[PDB]
Ligand binder design. Structure first.
Ligand SMILES: Nc1ncnc2c1ncn2[C@@H]1O[C@H](COP(=O)(O)OP(=O)(O)O)[C@@H](O)[C@H]1O
Length: 238
């Protein structure tokens, strides 16, 4: 409300979005058209922020409908999101249904193979150290969060997975894996924050298994935005 909030200087600006202040417990998130990979690979593609903001709002709404508490308040066309302000826990929570990305790179897993169960991986969000994977003991010792919190985070992650996986599967999409971030609101509540989009999920077409996520950009597979749009279309957002 009073969208001219954009004229202010962002509380924080990252490689893909800008966080603007609205008040004490709310922020405006701007999904820019910046797309990155590696972030040694970069470009600006028209419609990226629009599509990710649109997809993200729908997925958060779906999560909220299944009981998952998120930071989502509302979507403001074309690429804005009003969210509850939270203090992000410096951990990237990765849930994997199919082996891909670093998993196949670091361990003897066959690419595209269905995992026996959703693997949950916690990566430390720290550029200086190259976002190293963590184990519970390390995370606690670093003071990133308590054991109780870490496990609650895992529970939330798996719930998010069951909801999203079922949803995309019904839309002919295979949710390979995804990365979420969690933060605490003013009341100390653990909320799924950041975004849930083709930038943070690996999505394959069920039939052909064509890539529909940011991997087409990092691996130059074709029209990234056109594939991102396929996701929007599949979710009935266009
Ligand atoms: N509701 C929120 N409250 C405060 N900051 C948030 C919220 N959601 C996400 N963020 C922060 O916004 C940033 C996202 O920017 P990008 O998406 O630019 O991440 P980088 O900052 O690229 O990892 C992250 O640092 C994330 O922790």
């Amino acid at each position: 409300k009073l969208e001219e909030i954009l004229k202010k200087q962002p509380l924080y600006s990252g490689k893909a979005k800008s966080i603007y202040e609205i008040d004490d417990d709310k922020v405006l998130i701007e999904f820019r058209d910046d797309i990155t990979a590696g972030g040694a690979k970069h470009d600006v593609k028209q419609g990226k922020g629009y599509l990710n903001a649109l997809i993200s709002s729908k997925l958060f709404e779906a999560l909220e409908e299944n009981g998952v508490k998120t930071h989502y308040i509302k979507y403001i066309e074309p690429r804005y999101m009003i969210a509850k302000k939270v203090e992000i826990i410096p951990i990237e929570v990765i849930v994997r249904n199919i082996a891909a990305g670093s998993l196949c790179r670091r361990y003897p897993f066959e690419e595209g193979k269905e995992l026996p169960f959703p693997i949950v991986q916690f990566d430390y969000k720290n550029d200086e150290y190259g976002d190293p994977m963590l184990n519970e003991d390390i995370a606690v010792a670093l003071g990133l969060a308590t054991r109780e919190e870490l496990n609650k985070i895992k529970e939330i992650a798996l719930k998010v997975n069951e909801v999203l996986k079922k949803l995309f599967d019904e839309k002919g999409i295979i949710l390979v894996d995804f990365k979420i971030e969690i933060g605490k609101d003013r009341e100390g509540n653990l909320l799924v924050a950041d975004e849930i989009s083709p930038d943070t999920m690996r999505l394959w077409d069920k039939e052909t298994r064509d890539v529909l996520d940011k991997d087409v950009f990092r691996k130059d597979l074709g029209d990234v935005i056109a594939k991102y749009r396929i996701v929007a279309e599949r979710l009935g957002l266009l």
